[PDB]
Amino acid sequence: DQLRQEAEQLKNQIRDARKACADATLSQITNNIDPVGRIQMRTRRTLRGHLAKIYAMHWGTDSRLLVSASQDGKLIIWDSYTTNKVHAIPLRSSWVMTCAYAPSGNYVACGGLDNICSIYNLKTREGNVRVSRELAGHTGYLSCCRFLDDNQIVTSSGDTTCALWDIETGQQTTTFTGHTGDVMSLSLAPDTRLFVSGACDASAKLWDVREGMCRQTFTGHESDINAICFFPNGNAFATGSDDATCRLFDLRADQELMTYSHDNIICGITSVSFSKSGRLLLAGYDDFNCNVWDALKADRAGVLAGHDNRVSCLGVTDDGMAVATGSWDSFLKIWN
Amino acid sequence: TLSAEDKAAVERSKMIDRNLREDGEKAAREVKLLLLGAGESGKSTIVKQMKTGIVETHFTFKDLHFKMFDVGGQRSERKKWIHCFEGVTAIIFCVALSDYDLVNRMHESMKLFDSICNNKWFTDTSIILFLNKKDLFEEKIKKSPLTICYPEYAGSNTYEEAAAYIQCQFEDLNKRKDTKEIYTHFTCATDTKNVQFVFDAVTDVIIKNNLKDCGLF
């Protein structure tokens, strides 16, 4: 049809336009920068509590607590500083792929193959946590719920539709459809006005939360994308894929900058997370170990080999004081 | 050094850690049963034998509690979430016999079987095949050969040898006959005996797992 060839000519126009601005590689301009060196992180803690594979974790806003979800059916709110277990929430369905901890500390969201990421209310008068609300309406499988605030929650899905829910009325408001894949990760910008989503189309997209329309579309991966984190500045974001490479896209440059690839690496990527400054680009590889990355020099600076199964989730504190690379052997390890 | 009131917080951790273990033990008591099948192949017929997204079927039989996971409704990329089930005791299949002329969809089922038996995650989990709908299969075989979808077959049109042959044809896709064991029961409308096979098979695979953990086998 005419619309088809119009779509390819638009794609050619976009490619030529973004080729017209790529006049300097990031490594080319940062070649004269002193390297970070080597980053010897050691496992400061180990909470040998879980029994099944761990699929997600979200650090607290106050940089101390962290919620961790596992296939045993209980996501437990850790106290990273003192190894304690603040809470233990038995799920309705043991299948969980994501969990989020609200930036106010009084709400926990979690979901999986049950098409519902329930909202738990922690700081309640009734003494025990409970399902505050059961947000339902997706038709695939949720993969990353993230809290905008105590009322708005963005959710990924397996039915190509990221949704922005509204807790107090239950029913959602917008529906960020438009790419026909399987969204496996989300990432809120630091100003929380924009968020990016990674599906199995090998195409991460930058959505406007307020408007509801795809602001920008990024390509450059061949296989699926299942790990994305914003740069702390808020104008770049690194994507993790099964390609054994991590790519760093820019929002204002609208295109790829770096490809954190390694010939020795053949395993996929499960989760990616920058550092507080952004220099370090941590990433959870599928070969049972993490791997740091100098995000302006494209060469590694250490390996966090401390797990026996694949590391399936990461998180970096808002203070930048720690990471914790949760893996499938039921052990999170708070590196530093 | 010690803390002060935070030792009671540590006690709270212990007070739920113990409970965590007593739920973990209970989790080992339950038997997991991933349920696959073609589009309305036999899934409804096998779930109706005994009491949105995944619809878990909890039921018990002779002091053993089963969980069944009807994962057909997950209309998405299977390989993205199939690794969540690495640990399920048994992949209870269900493929209809009567679905052997429309779109040779058993070969599509073979592809599905090829995806799940040769899968990297399920390199140790048994596959309890269920070639149900015997009656309609007998009707459609009394008036049509198996060559309508699989020309290479050159046997007879009687039920028994052809059914055993296609059972062996399914079993030949294993390629790892030692670590696992692909069961199979040709059952439709067999009342409690179907469930009895399920209990027997899961007790067998649990005993095999225990023998492998202790090292006897």
Partner: single-chain antibody, 233 residues
Framework: DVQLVESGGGLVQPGGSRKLSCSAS????????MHWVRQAPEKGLEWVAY????????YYADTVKGRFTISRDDPKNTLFLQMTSLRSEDTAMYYC??????????????WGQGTTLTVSSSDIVMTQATSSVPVTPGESVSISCRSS???????????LYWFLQRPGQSPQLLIY???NLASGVPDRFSGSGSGTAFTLTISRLEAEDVGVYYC?????????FGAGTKLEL
């Protein structure tokens, strides 16, 4: 909502026995380290005995150790204190206090109505500043409370609390760990100070807030209250 009601009480014979019972409806009683507190009819509060969650730990005040005992009936949600050899100084009004201990938790959230018990005829001492402060609605109030030990633990949060016992009522928490606020009270209250020197600042006071404020610490058992400052008009 959360409800704590007691039983027993009245007048007894000195030296006898009395099982005081505290009911509990409306919360997860199984995971609440409960307390008991004495209130003599003419002076301030004093800690009786603490029971942990799941009965895994038991404490007592030094003056009552070896005379009482706490038993938890978790399936029926009832807390018993058995008193034996009651002397003339053991007459008071008794409150059963729920409390949950984790990171960011607020112990002493909700206090029972309390029951009276009338018999017939070292540790951190929390000193107050006065017994009455004449105030008017609208202005500010600055209660002060010194201590006798450095309440600033190594983890960096001083385990000092505050309360408010309005007349003919039961005291509820206002400030826990000297900076935080109890869920259900206005943000006009504000604690401050250093170790061994703590201050509460009631900003823009109005009526119905004229009860006694009991300075309390929680570093080490036996946790001890203060004499309280009964402000009036």
């Amino acid at each position: 909502d959360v409800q704590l009601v007691e039983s027993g009480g009245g007048l007894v014979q000195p030296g006898g026995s009395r099982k005081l019972s505290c009911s509990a409806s409306g919360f997860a009683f199984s995971s609440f380290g409960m307390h008991w507190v004495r209130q003599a009819p003419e002076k301030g509060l004093e800690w009786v005995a603490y029971i942990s969650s799941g009965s895994g730990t038991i404490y007592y005040a030094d003056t009552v150790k070896g005379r009482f005992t706490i038993s938890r009936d978790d399936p029926k949600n009832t807390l018993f204190l058995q008193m034996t050899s009651l002397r003339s100084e053991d007459t008071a009004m008794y409150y059963c206090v729920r409390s949950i201990y984790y990171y960011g938790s607020s112990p002493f959230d909700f206090w029972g109505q309390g029951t009276t018990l009338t018999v017939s005829s070292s540790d951190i001492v929390m000193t107050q500043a006065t017994s009455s402060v004449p105030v008017t609605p609208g202005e500010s109030v600055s209660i002060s409370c010194r201590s006798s030990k450095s309440l600033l633990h190594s983890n960096g949060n001083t385990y000092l609390y505050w309360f408010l016992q309005r007349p003919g009522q039961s005291p509820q928490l206002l400030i826990y760990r000297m900076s935080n606020l109890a869920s259900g009270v206005p943000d006009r209250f504000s604690g401050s100070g250093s170790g061994t020197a703590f201050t509460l600042t009631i900003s823009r006071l109005e009526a119905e807030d004229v009860g006694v404020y009991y300075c309390m610490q929680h570093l080490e058992y036996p946790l001890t209250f203060g004499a309280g400052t009964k402000l009036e008009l």
